């Protein structure tokens, strides 16, 4: 065979091995997840405490594109770093011909195209790391998951990382007992829960919680992270529902 | 730079080059050789913009004695005025064009005759039994036309000379300070150490 | 462009490409040079496996550099004309600029380089060439003889030997040649060379090469009589 | 990122074949039989257009294409590498012929240009050979009417009459015993229908068998008139009907 | 047409004693016949006991002072925390200048 | 990434040989047979086509000689797209020079140089050589009559008699035998036929298997005149020889 | 095949460390620094008695205040040089001062990391780099083709050096005069040279602040070669 | 081999990574159909969403490529899009160069010589991806041309892709050799439409509920795609039949 | 194993073993350690010699007046990011005038690393950083590594038995974050930490190197004589 020893080779069977071990170095990483509400969206990750000499606080794993997206990903950090900053100039790019901020699902597809671009050739390595994001923008809210072949959907809520299963469940339940939607400060408790849930499947470590959001009521449009007060009300809704 | 000229007589080709090297209102040397040799049997006279003339003489020198290396062998007359006109007609459509005029006189050894060119910047070249560049053709020319003839021995080609030499003397404004003579023939080149 | 590495060392600290092309070095046809009190011979073996060549028009073994330097070499003919030209116009080139023909240690300190830079950069393979390399600075006596190889390594010699056999005919140079005192004559260091070639050679025929510099650029090549003379009298006086 | 693959793939063995041009020809044997005759006022290349479903209208699918008003070509081989073929065969009809002298090319010169870029794909970084190999037919003024044969290692043949890919052994065959030099091109047309036969399997009819020529001035075919001196292509497309009428007297 | 000069006045002045110097120049900028400023300096500390004043467009007087020092940072950098002469200074300063001899900056300068 | 599907066409075997060379001239030794014959009034070159179907256009055809300018033809072996890439840069090379100095390019000085873009693509750019092995004949006021062959390494020699192709061991032994120094052109055309007779894989030579051009001062005084044998006159010459 | 920018498992790059190797077989160099001086001796190593000894530089001048040995494939030092020296002189067109000798040695050793898929190989050659500033004194540096480079009192490099640097261990103190510094250099030369030493087949050499960079003419070392015979006879 | 991993020759003048991206043409276990009416071009697909966590309205395999030509992707999603974005693309420059609208046989000649390229070109791979373009052309009338991995395409009465693609194909063959013509006989679209349905639920022996389906309409002048309501309506015609 | 070939490759359990190597280089440096309090920020190296005839190869490289790295691991690539860093720093002065913030130099570093690791020919950096500086928001210490991967902390160590050094910090964590306003003390603590990853050899004068920065004193560094005050 041979068929996996270089990214872009297709296998008898139809597959991109590379790929799909891109997708390994995804599993392998820590839990992090996105929950669309009524007018926003919520993003929350786990944090693994390495070391008592990690500063809380102080090692930020979610990022902003624009004023009105965030983006979260697990995998190799440092791939998910280069796939904002190609966000970032994607809509600087996009705002400065159009005028208007750029829309979430034009921006998913820039993302889109350009991770697929990195499965056309041997002489570049598929992205290790799947990302969620999403945002407000003037047709509503949206979230999207984006994964290694560069395979993108929107989704009514979305997880990835190790506790992807754990978490994609407690999601499912969510769905199920609100058809009628989930309000953006309640999405952020449940959003907390969902982490602590799902750090069952990494669990030697203790962690750090974070927690952000965009909701058209309650960031204004904008993209925030949740702090101090708002923060600790969360981290309490979770220490609870796990006892 | 000013006066170059060029006779082609019975068996040889004689050329004439004005000594002066003058900058502003300073004779800067009176004793300039304003030519090169380009092979054995081939001398190029250069006349015109500072700089260019010298720089211009030498590239192609370099050239023709790459040649004569590469093939171990001497390009005709032809041969040489062939590339040298090629090489200003190129120059004259560049971003700084060279601004020389150039005489070639050689000895073709295959054919046994003297050869004249006389080729300006722009790449203008012709065959001629004499030739100048510059304000001194204006006098010699006509000069030629009636004392010159074919058939004329080496000594007599040089007489010719003196003629147009103090003729130039004569009526020219400026000092050019006497000329340098060299004479291609069979047997190469030389120049006269007194003229 | 196209890239590759093609000359990377091995886990022993080899560079194997480099190597290989003194392999194509030692397949090719030997040549000698010798240095005189005087002057400096260029001998090359020609291979006889072949009649029926034109030898007024078929490439000489031994090249002018400039009219004061000349250039043999053993290994790959199509290789050797690549260095011939380069050094050809650096020569030129050096004349216009400095107003001075090269030295022989410059010009061989060129060609040098020109090999070994071959064998670092991408794409390319190092020349499968050696070369011997002679003549007189200008407005000097003392006679001047280098060697090249494919590695880029050059330096100076009272006679050497390059090709196939060559460690034959340098073995008998080695024994031959006294520093103390150099063959005094013209005459005595042409045949100091083709005594080395008939060690290795076969007849004394249309099979060796000579040419001899003197300073002033005072070169010429020989012609197959004044070397068969040479030839036939080695033989006569062999008989011991 | 970009093709970093500068280096040749097809490359020499020690037997000294050039394998990647060895298996060209082994797809062009696998395609389907196309022929070319040359008559003495014309030329006929056809194909049989061997339909993929018989829901797709195969006219659209054109084997047999002009290339200049007095040349056409035909492949066996691979369809997508003959169609940019075709491409890259018309436009340097212009590029490096007309757009100089004002006319196009004649035969020999346009085939040698498409032989270069088959060539080329031989040797060049990056590319494999294409799959196919052409029969060009056409005329000019001065060399009058011929028919050429391309292979993908770029070599070219200049032929009385032949045929290629699948049945071309037997179709060769045929073709030395009916061929020669007094064949009015109506004779030619007939017997490129009988050779063709032989090869075709299933229907056989003038919707599965595609046929043009290299004939005479068509001024119907010009699109103006009033300069007399032009007088409109040698290439034509039989049409399914014209190609029924002659299975009928076959 | 645009011009990319100006003229931005003020003076400065140099003097050399056995164990000391002085670079001093006055604190007005001008355009024309207006003031811009009655105190914008432009004598500076440079590092390494040197001061500099560049003299006359001060866009361009700025940028050299600021390459200078930028200069005098990297000479640190490179040659380990070596001081810089007086001497290197205006060398190194001729050559930031010539490096614009067909785009000059329109200064005079002291050190 | 790349690297994986690169064969390396440019490095030495651990012999100091150039793999892609060695196996270009295994190709070429299979191609029909060409060969150059000088004589002391003209040059001959002869060449065998591949074989044959009886429906090949014969007269509308060119595979083996190759006119490159009025003084100097080719004879090719091995690949003919190949070869018509280097003919078509040694075609224009003749141009430039006779643009340049107004003079007809010396044959040698063509050759090196075609000779010479064949070297390089032994030593650089990860390309494969060229199959193809040619031999020169042409006419220049230095050197007169001149042979010349080049293989795909980029090395060129001189000959007075020579084939490429296949059977060239045969066939150098046949000329080595019967080519002597004195010879007409008319000689040469005989012994070039009566070579190829003896060396040909085929059951007879016959003209509609043949190339056949001569260089001869064939015009009027101190010209040189080219001549492409249509094949009506090969047909004629195999006749007048005896060989049919 | 495999990339020449590749890692092995321990950390290490093949290509540096396969060069690390070539460097061994190169004939022997070596340095010691003094108040007083830095000395620079090298193995000339002719391949035949036919070569013409004095011909071989492996000793080299880079400025007046600086010098070179090398070890190992020296036909890729000579660009090395070229840029020393190139790097010396612009420095001091730039600065109107002499260039420190930490500060030319790193500019060297900038070029040695250069390489990949820029050159194609690391360089096959160690450099000694021997000289005066003002600033720190004499200096000695051994420059790699890693792109590392140490400061040593003294060392060896090429064949000989394991044996020769052990020696130099014990030899070296801070107050040898450069005269001593000079005898040592020749006696572990002798010591682990194949053939037997002579003022033909080694060569040397000192950097002084008051006459810089020098090379010993072949008169002025046999006086010194018999100096040490008549030391080692003396006890 | 390494045959196998580029585009270039096997022995017997083949190339596997083109053979292997058909083969990920099916990766999606998705069938798609299309035919023409008198007026119009229809295009079907199945619609399958397995996770409950996705947001239906975006997932979708046909795409609108200019306001006359859609076209669907049997294939993966990444493939398809970038398939989508590069025609798109050519179509808009088509109209910008040449002054009128690219029509659908070009469009489709265009991208078929864009993978052609990666059949000959060894650093691009070729797309897993099948392309089916459809359009009421104003010179042709209603068209349906269909591009593959190897660089073929043409023209078609009407064509189906997917796993269950050769059931769906004799289901219309059969249509045709009965209805003797080139076409659906068909006034409005919406009964093309319901055609096509019919007949895919014969073929496949399936059942289709509004959101199993993806439904493209080509007319003059637009290509649209309908929502869940219309096929609601257009599956409600059909069952009261 | 089959994956080890390039960087542009991914294991079939989803690891990059050329990057893995690299970070080997890392392990087989000599130790050097980092730690902050809220007004000082310092680190301690160990520098490692060749020979006792040989210097000790210096580990520690100053940035900017508010920032610098030690290192461990390949030289010439700290070399390489430290001019990179002093370029970035430069950048940001004579543009905005502004001090390059710590935690920005970190992404920077990173996405520089990330792109050696994604691309063919390329190869990842070899060597490890740990950076500190005093900005506009106080004391900072950042560890690099060459993954692409960068991370904040009060303390760390790495090198050649760094995990003793980096226990040690985390027993100590409450004693030296609040050893504010005394730079003495807090460099005791740093070399006091470093000793738990010695072994058969302890602290001289020209083998300890130590560099402090905070909010009143400039990035400098101590070697020699200077660092006599604390064996």
């Not at chain 7, 193995?43 to 090398?70: F, N, W, Y």
């Not at chain 7, 050659?125 to 003294?154: C, K, M, W």
């Amino acid at each position: 065979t041979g068929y996996d020893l270089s990214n872009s080779v297709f296998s008898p069977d139809g597959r991109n091995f590379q790929v799909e071990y891109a997708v390994k170095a995804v599993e392998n990483g820590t839990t992090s997840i996105g929950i669309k509400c009524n007018d926003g969206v919520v993003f929350a990750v786990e944090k693994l405490i390495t070391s008592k000499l990690l500063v809380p606080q102080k090692n930020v794993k979610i990022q902003v594109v624009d004023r009105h997206i965030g983006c979260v990903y697990s995998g190799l950090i440092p791939d998910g770093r280069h796939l904002v900053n190609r966000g970032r100039e994607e809509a600087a790019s996009f705002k400065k011909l159009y005028k208007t901020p750029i829309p979430i699902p034009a921006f998913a597809d820039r993302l889109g195209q350009y991770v697929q671009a990195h499965t056309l050739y041997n002489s570049v390595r598929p992205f290790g790391v799947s990302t969620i994001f999403g945002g407000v923008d003037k047709n509503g809210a949206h979230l999207y998951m984006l994964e290694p072949s560069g395979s993108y959907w929107g989704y009514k809520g979305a997880a990835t990382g190790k506790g992807r299963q754990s978490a994609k469940a407690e999601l499912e339940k969510l769905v199920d007992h609100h058809p009628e939607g989930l309000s953006a400060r309640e999405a952020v408790k449940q959003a907390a829960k969902i982490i602590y849930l799902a750090h069952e499947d990494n669990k030697e470590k203790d962690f750090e919680l974070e927690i952000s959001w965009c909701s058209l009521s309650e960031t204004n449009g904008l993209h925030k992270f949740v702090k101090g007060d708002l923060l600790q009300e969360a981290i309490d809704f979770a220490q609870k529902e796990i006892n | 730079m000013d006066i170059i000229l060029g006779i082609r007589v019975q068996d040889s080709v004689i050329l004439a080059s004005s000594k002066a090297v003058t900058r502003g209102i300073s004779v800067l040397k009176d004793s300039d050789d304003k030519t090169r040799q380009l092979s054995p049997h081939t001398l190029m006279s250069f006349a015109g913009e500072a700089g260019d003339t010298v720089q211009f003489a030498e590239y192609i020198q370099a050239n023709i004695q790459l040649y004569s290396i590469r093939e171990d062998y001497e390009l005709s007359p032809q041969a040489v005025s062939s590339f040298v006109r090629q090489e200003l007609a190129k120059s004259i459509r560049s971003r700084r064009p060279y601004q020389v005029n150039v005489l070639i006189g050689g000895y073709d050894k295959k054919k046994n005759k003297p050869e004249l060119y006389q080729i300006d910047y722009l790449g203008t070249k012709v065959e001629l039994p004499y030739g100048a560049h510059g304000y001194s053709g204006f006098y010699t020319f006509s000069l030629l036309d009636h004392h010159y003839r074919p058939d004329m021995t080496t000594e007599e080609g040089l007489d010719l000379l003196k003629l147009c030499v103090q003729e130039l003397e004569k009526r020219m404004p400026m000092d050019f300070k006497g000329v340098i003579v060299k004479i291609v023939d069979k047997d190469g080149i030389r120049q006269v150490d007194d003229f | 462009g196209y890239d590759r590495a093609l000359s990377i060392f091995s886990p022993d600290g080899h560079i194997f490409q480099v190597e290989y092309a003194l392999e194509a070095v030692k397949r090719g046809t030997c040549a000698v040079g010798v240095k005189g009190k005087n002057c400096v011979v260029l001998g090359c073996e020609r291979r006889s496996t072949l009649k029926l060549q034109d030898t007024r028009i078929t490439p000489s073994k031994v090249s002018k550099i400039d009219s004061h330097v000349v250039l043999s070499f053993s290994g790959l003919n199509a290789d050797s004309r690549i260095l011939i030209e380069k050094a050809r116009v650096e020569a030129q080139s050096h004349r216009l600029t400095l107003e001075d023909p090269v030295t022989v240690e410059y010009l061989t300190r060129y060609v040098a380089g020109v090999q070994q830079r071959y064998t670092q950069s991408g794409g390319v393979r190092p020349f499968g060439v050696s070369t011997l390399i002679a003549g007189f600075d200008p407005r000097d006596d003392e006679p001047k003889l280098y060697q090249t190889e494919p590695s880029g390594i050059y330096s100076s010699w009272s006679a050497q030997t390059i090709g196939r056999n060559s460690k034959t005919v340098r073995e008998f140079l080695e024994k031959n040649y006294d520093r103390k005192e150099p063959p005094a004559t013209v005459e005595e260091c042409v045949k100091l060379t083709v005594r080395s070639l008939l060690e290795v050679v076969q007849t004394g025929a249309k099979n060796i090469e000579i040419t001899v510099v003197k300073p002033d650029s005072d070169i010429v090549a020989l012609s197959s009589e004044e070397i068969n003379q040479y030839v036939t009298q080695i033989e006569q006086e062999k008989q011991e | 990122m970009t093709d970093r693959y500068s280096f040749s793939l097809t490359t020499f063995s020690p037997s000294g074949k050039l394998g990647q041009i060895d298996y060209a020809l082994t797809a062009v044997k696998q395609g389907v039989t196309s022929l070319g005759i040359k008559a003495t006022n014309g030329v006929v290349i056809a194909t049989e257009k061997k339909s993929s479903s018989p829901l797709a209208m195969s006219e659209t699918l054109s084997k047999v294409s002009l290339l200049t008003p007095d040349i056409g070509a035909v492949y066996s081989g691979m369809g997508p590498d003959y169609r940019v073929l075709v491409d890259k065969s018309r436009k340097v009809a212009h590029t490096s012929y007309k757009r100089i002298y004002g006319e196009y090319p004649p035969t020999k010169l346009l085939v040698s240009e498409v032989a270069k870029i088959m060539q080329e794909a031989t040797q060049s970084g990056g590319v494999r050979p294409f799959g196919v190999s052409l029969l060009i037919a056409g005329h000019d003024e001065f060399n009058g009417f011929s028919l050429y044969q391309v292979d993908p290692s770029g070599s070219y043949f200049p032929w009385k009459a032949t045929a290629i890919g699948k049945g071309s052994v037997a179709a060769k065959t045929f073709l030395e015993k009916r061929w020669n030099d007094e064949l009015e091109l109506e004779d030619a047309i007939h017997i490129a229908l009988l050779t063709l036969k032989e090869s075709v399997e299933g229907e056989f009819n003038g919707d599965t068998i595609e046929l043009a020529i290299i004939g005479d001035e068509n001024p119907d075919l010009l699109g103006y008139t009033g300069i007399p001196t032009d007088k409109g292509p040698r290439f034509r497309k039989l049409t399914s009907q014209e190609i029924n009428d002659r299975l009928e007297a076959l | 047409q645009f011009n990319p000069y100006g003229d931005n006045g003020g003076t400065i002045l140099g003097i050399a004693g056995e164990d000391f110097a002085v670079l001093a120049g006055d604190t007005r900028n001008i355009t024309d016949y207006s003031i811009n400023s009655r105190y914008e300096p432009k004598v500076f500390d440079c590092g390494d006991n040197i001061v500099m004043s560049a003299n006359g467009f001060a866009a361009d007087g700025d940028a050299l002072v600021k390459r200078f020092k930028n200069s005098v940072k990297w000479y640190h950098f490179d040659h380990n925390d070596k001081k810089l002469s007086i001497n290197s200074a205006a060398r190194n300063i001729q050559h930031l200048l010539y490096g614009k001899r067909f785009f000059p900056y329109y200064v005079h300068t002291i050190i | 990434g790349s690297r994986r599907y690169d064969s390396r066409t440019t490095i030495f075997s651990p012999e100091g040989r150039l793999y892609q060379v060695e196996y270009a001239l295994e190709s070429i030794s299979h191609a029909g047979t060409a060969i150059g014959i000088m004589a002391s009034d003209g040059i001959v070159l002869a060449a065998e086509r591949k074989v044959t179907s009886t429906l090949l256009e014969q007269d509308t055809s060119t595979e083996k000689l190759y006119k490159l300018n009025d003084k100097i033809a080719v004879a090719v072996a091995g690949l003919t797209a190949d070869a018509e890439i280097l003919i078509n840069t040694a075609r224009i090379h003749a141009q430039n020079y006779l643009k340049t100095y107004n003079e007809d390019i010396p044959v040698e000085i063509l050759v090196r140089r075609l000779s010479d873009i064949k070297q390089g693509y032994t030593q650089h750019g990860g390309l494969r050589p060229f199959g193809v092995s040619f031999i020169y004949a042409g006419y220049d006021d230095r050197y007169g009559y001149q042979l010349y062959t080049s293989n795909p390494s980029g090395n060129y020699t001189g000959w007075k008699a020579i084939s490429v192709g296949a059977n060239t061991s045969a066939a150098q032994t046949l000329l080595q035998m019967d080519y002597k120094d004195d010879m007409k052109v008319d000689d040469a055309i005989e012994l070039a036929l009566k070579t190829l007779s003896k060396t040909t894989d085929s059951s007879a030579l016959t003209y509609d298997r043949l190339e056949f051009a001569t260089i001869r001062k064939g015009a009027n005084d101190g010209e040189v005149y080219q001549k492409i044998f249509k094949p009506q006159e090969i047909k004629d010459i195999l006749v007048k020889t005896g060989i049919t | 095949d495999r990339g020449v920018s590749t890692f092995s498992p321990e950390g290490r790059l093949f290509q540096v460390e396969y060069s690390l190797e070539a460097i061994k077989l190169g004939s022997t160099a070596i340095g010691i620094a003094t108040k007083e001086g830095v000395v620079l001796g090298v193995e000339k190593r002719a391949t035949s008695p036919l070569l013409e000894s004095d011909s071989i530089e492996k000793i080299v001048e880079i400025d007046r205040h600086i010098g070179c040995a090398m070890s190992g494939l020296t036909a890729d030092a000579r660009s090395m040089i070229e840029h020393a020296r190139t790097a010396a002189v612009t420095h001091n067109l730039y600065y109107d001062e002499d260039i420190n000798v930490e500060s030319l040695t790193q500019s060297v050793c900038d070029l040695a990391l250069r390489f990949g898929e820029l050159m194609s190989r690391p360089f096959g050659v160690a450099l000694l780099i021997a000289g005066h500033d003002a600033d720190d004194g004499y200096q000695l540096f051994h420059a790699e083709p890693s792109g590392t480079f140490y400061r040593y009192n003294a060392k060896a490099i090429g064949s000989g050096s394991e044996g020769a640097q052990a020696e130099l261990l014990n030899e070296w103190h801070s107050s040898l005069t450069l005269k001593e510094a000079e005898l040592l250099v020749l006696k572990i030369l002798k010591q682990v040279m194949e053939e037997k030493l002579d003022e033909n087949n080694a060569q040397l050499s000192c950097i002084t602040k008051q006459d810089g960079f020098k090379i010993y003419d072949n008169e002025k070392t046999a006086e010194l070669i018999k100096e040490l015979k008549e030391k080692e006879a003396a006890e | 081999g390494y045959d196998r991993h580029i585009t270039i020759f096997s022995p017997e003048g083949r190339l596997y990574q083109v053979e292997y991206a058909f083969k990920a043409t099916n990766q999606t276990n998705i069938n798609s159909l299309a035919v023409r009416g008198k007026d119009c071009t229809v295009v079907i697909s199945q619609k399958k969403v397995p996770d409950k966590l996705l947001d239906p309205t975006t997932v979708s395999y046909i795409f609108c490529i200019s306001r006359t030509i859609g076209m669907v992707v049997n294939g993966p999603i990444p493939d398809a899009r970038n398939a989508a974005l590069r025609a798109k693309a050519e179509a808009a420059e088509f109209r910008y160069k040449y002054g009128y609208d690219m029509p659908c046989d070009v469009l489709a000649k265009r991208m078929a010589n864009l993978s052609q390229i990666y059949t000959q070109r060894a650093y691009m791979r070729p797309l897993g991806v099948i392309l089916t373009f459809v359009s009421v052309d104003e010179e042709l009338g209603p068209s349906i041309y269909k591009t593959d991995p190897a660089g073929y395409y043409v023209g078609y009465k009407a064509t189906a892709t997917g796993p269950k693609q050769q059931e769906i194909t004799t289901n219309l063959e059969n249509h045709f050799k009965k209805s003797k013509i080139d076409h659906i006989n068909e006034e409005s679209w919406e009964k093309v439409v319901e055609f096509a349905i019919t007949h895919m639920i014969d073929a496949l022996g399936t059942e289709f509920s509004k959101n199993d389906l993806e439904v493209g309409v080509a007319t003059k002048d637009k290509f649209f795609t309908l929502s869940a309501e219309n096929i609601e309506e257009r599956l409600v015609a059909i069952a009261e039949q | 194993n089959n994956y080890d070939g390039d960087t542009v490759t991914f294991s079939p359990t989803g690891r990059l073993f050329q990057v893995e190597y690299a970070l080997e280089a890392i392990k087989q440096g000599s130790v050097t350690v980092g730690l902050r309090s809220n007004t000082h920020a310092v680190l301690v190296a160990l520098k490692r010699n060749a020979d006792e005839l040989s210097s000790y190869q210096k580990k520690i490289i100053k940035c900017d007046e508010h920032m610098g790295l030690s290192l461990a691991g390949l030289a010439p690539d700290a070399r390489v990011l430290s001019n990179y860093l002093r370029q970035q720093c430069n950048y940001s002065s004579l543009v905005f005038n502004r001090k390059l913030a710590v935690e920005r130099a970190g992404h920077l570093l990173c996405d520089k690393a990330q792109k050696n690791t994604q691309s063919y020919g390329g190869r990842p950096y070899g060597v490890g950083l740990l950076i500190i500086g005093y900005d506009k928001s106080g004391a900072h210490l950042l560890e690099f590594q060459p993954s692409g991967n960068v991370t904040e902390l009060y303390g760390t160590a790495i090198g050649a038995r760094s995990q003793g050094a980096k226990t040690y910090l985390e027993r100590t964590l409450d004693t030296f974050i609040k050893i504010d306003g005394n730079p003495d003390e807090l460099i005791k603590a740093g070399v006091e930490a470093i000793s738990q990853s010695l072994r058969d050899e302890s602290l001289t004068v020209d083998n300890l190197s130590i560099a402090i920065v905070g909010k009143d004193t400039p990035f400098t560094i101590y070697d020699g004589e200077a660092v006599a005050k604390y064996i």
